[PDB]
Amino acid sequence: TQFEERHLKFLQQLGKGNFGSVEMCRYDPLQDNTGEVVAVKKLQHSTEEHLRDFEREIEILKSLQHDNIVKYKGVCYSRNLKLIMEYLPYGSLRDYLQKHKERIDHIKLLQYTSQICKGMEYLGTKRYIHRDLATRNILVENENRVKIGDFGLTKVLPQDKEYYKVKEPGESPIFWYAPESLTESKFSVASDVWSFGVVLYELFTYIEKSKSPPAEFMRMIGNDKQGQMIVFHLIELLKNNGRLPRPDGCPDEIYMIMTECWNNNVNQRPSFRDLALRVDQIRDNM
Numbered sequence: 001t002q003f004e005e006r007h008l009k010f011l012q013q014l015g016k017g018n019f020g021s022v023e024m025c026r027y028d029p030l031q032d033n034t035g036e037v038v039a040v041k042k043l044q045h046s047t048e049e050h051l052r053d054f055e056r057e058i059e060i061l062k063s064l065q066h067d068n069i070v071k072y073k074g075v076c077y078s079r080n081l082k083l084i085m086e087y088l089p090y091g092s093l094r095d096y097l098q099k100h101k102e103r104i105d106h107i108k109l110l111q112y113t114s115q116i117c118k119g120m121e122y123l124g125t126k127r128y129i130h131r132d133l134a135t136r137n138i139l140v141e142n143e144n145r146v147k148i149g150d151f152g153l154t155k156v157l158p159q160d161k162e163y164y165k166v167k168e169p170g171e172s173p174i175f176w177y178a179p180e181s182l183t184e185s186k187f188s189v190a191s192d193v194w195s196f197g198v199v200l201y202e203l204f205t206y207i208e209k210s211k212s213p214p215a216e217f218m219r220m221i222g223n224d225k226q227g228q229m230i231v232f233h234l235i236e237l238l239k240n241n242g243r244l245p246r247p248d249g250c251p252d253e254i255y256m257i258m259t260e261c262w263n264n265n266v267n268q269r270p271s272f273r274d275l276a277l278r279v280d281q282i283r284d285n286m
């Protein structure tokens with residue numbers, strides 16, 4: 001069924017990014033304010049290149065049906081398309097964890113970790129590369145469920161290759177990037193696994209500001225480094241085994257999972273199927 005533009009009542013801005021904006025809207029055809037609250041994504045500056053990428057993101061989201069992937073609801077046509085998605089009122093895992101801090105125990109962080117792995121494994125079966133796995137891009141449905149949000153940077157692997165090469169990169173979350181992504185702009189399941197190790201780190205630091213991957217990496221390379229020199233030094237640091245520290249109070253076993261994800265050798269990084277099995281075993285033991 002279709003969504004009429006005239007019936008989408010603006011409520012609040014949710015955020016802005018990669019040439020798009022996300023708003024919380026009430027889909028109210030009855031005009032009595034009893035309509036469903038939905039998340040609406042639209043392009044801000046809609047060029048023919050941006051429309052093309054937006055359409056691809058719509059096709060990607062529509063093709064995904066998993067408990068740990070934000071639900072596609074529809075499209076609203078007025079091109080200047082609007083992507084309609086389910087609204088998750090608890091917001092991002094980043095904001096949720098920052099607010100609720102250590103009142104969320106290790107058992108609970110591992111329940112979220114497992115769900116992220118499962119969502120990522122399912123994504124990999126479709127030959128999709130997320131490229132922006134971070135706690136800011138994970139949504140909380142409720143206390144017991146998290147989902148991967150924002151597919152704006154997702155690439156589909158070529159039929160004959162196991163990596164996607166970005167020729168002209170835009171805004172990049174470099175402190176979540178695998179070394180081959182920094183040096184050769186190569187993205188794969190293995191680079192998504194590297195970013196997952198960074199997600200696990202974020203979780204176990206409970207989003208403490210001084211402990212964030214940009215703060216830790218900047219201290220390691222020197223806060224005097226600027227622009228492209230940050231990328232140059234981060235590459236050399238990663239090459240010489242500089243890694244994010246073990247978060248305070250993080251179990252040894254969870255830090256080992258992070259370090260395995262952060263392997264310079266792309267083939268030696270674990271698989272998401274293995275990670276979900278491993279994390280479920282840790283959970284069971286606890």
Ligand SMILES: CC[C@@](C)(Nc1ccnc(-c2c[nH]c3ncccc23)n1)C(=O)NCC(F)(F)F
Pocket residue numbers: 014015016017022039070085086087088089090091092136137138139148149150
């Ligand atoms: C896309 C919206 C945006 C900019 N920021 C947020 C921030 C807080 N809360 C919501 C939100 C709540 N409920 C929703 N339901 C669906 C989509 C988004 C939301 N979004 C983003 O890219 N960051 C997270 C991602 F997980 F969505 F990817």
